[PDB]
Design a protein around this ligand. Sequence first.
Ligand code: HEM
Ligand SMILES: COc1ccc(C(=O)O)cc1
Ligand SMILES: [Cl-]
Ligand SMILES: [Mg+2]
Length: 393
Amino acid sequence: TIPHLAIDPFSLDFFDDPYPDQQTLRDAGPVVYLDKWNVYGVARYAEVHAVLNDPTTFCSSRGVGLSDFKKEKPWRPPSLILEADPPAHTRPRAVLSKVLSPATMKTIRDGFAAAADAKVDELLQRGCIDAIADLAEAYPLSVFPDAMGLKQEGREHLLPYAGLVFNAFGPPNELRQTAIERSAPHQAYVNEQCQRPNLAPGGFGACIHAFTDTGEITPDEAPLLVRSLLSGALQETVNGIGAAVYCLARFPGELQRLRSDPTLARNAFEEAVRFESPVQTFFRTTTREVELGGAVIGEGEKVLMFLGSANRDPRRWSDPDLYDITRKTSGHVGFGSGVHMCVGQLVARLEGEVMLSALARKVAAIDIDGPVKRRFNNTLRGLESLPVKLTPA
Ligand code: HEM
Ligand SMILES: COc1ccc(C(=O)O)cc1
Ligand SMILES: [Cl-]
Ligand SMILES: [Mg+2]
């Protein structure tokens, strides 16, 4: 009844151009079976949204990568937030929501905006830059580690650790094997920075440790909650900013609109998140037999959700493959949906907004002027290198 496909969504050919295969996955049916990895797949907006919003049946505590924690040992101790279900999920989630709160955003916004303006001014002095290393990576590295309270030494481990985390959600392919082989120094750095003395006063990490006396989390849970912010924050934000820059270079008409109204910056970044979907996929594991898309799925089955595909499903979006900075983006699943929907989305949107604002006010043209190189990762979509010339306004 359900169609079986041989597409490997973790193959390098797929990462190089996923969009035809994503249409094949959507058009084969609401629920497919991926024979390569023995998992169910859902690639249409409707089923992805449904799975995300039914956490009791489609749980996260057996892992959100291919590996089922009831069958195999997790490669690192489970996240207390991403890899927990309600009710254990609820109070750690509340702590992170309060650490990354609207009030925190109000405290840090002016500094984040000044750093974005300064970065764009610096890049305009050079003219020809790499929009990944010099902009998409450099800007978040110039604000987020400081906002965390991390010391200067060792920050070169942050992006590699993130890459490892996201490769480890994938199947046991070469990308995953090599990531875990290289993991020791990055893991050692990250775990040590999670301890209370190593997080500067007033930053996100110190605030997590200060939140250990309310009955929501205990002191021994704070290191792993800091670890979450050192796992899934930087690389996907970098990839989203890089995708926004790529889109503004490839769609110059949209840079022209953004220049004419810099208040479009926040939505231009949200649209880049939908269009690129830096986090392409996550898994859930069924806890009981369930009907989904007319199919019956048994207990203990992995279900692969194609977030990027759901964000390009023509059943839900008009002209899904176009970058449109005035699109009504509400409802996209680039940050997930439901109880696990990105707790750090306010930070990501702040960083993306203020960078696109700086570009909107300061840059007249963004022209690709060298070979564009893609970075392969089992879960993240993003560029390795984006050579551009920036023309000042
Ligand atoms: C464009 C940038 C970002 C993207 C695309 C993104 C994507 C996502 C997605 C799709 C989820 C849902 C996971 C699931 O349903 O299993 C999520 C959760 C999460 N994100 Fe983000 N994220 C971004 C930035 C950030 C930032 C900046 C932070 C921290 C400051 C952060 C921290 C987290 C955490 C801790 C969770 C787990 C929430 C939970 O399980 O309740 N993310 N993110
Ligand atoms: C969305 O990606 C992630 C990855 C890791 C974590 C975590 O380690 O808690 C959270 C979100
Ligand atoms: Cl680890
Ligand atoms: Mg090797």
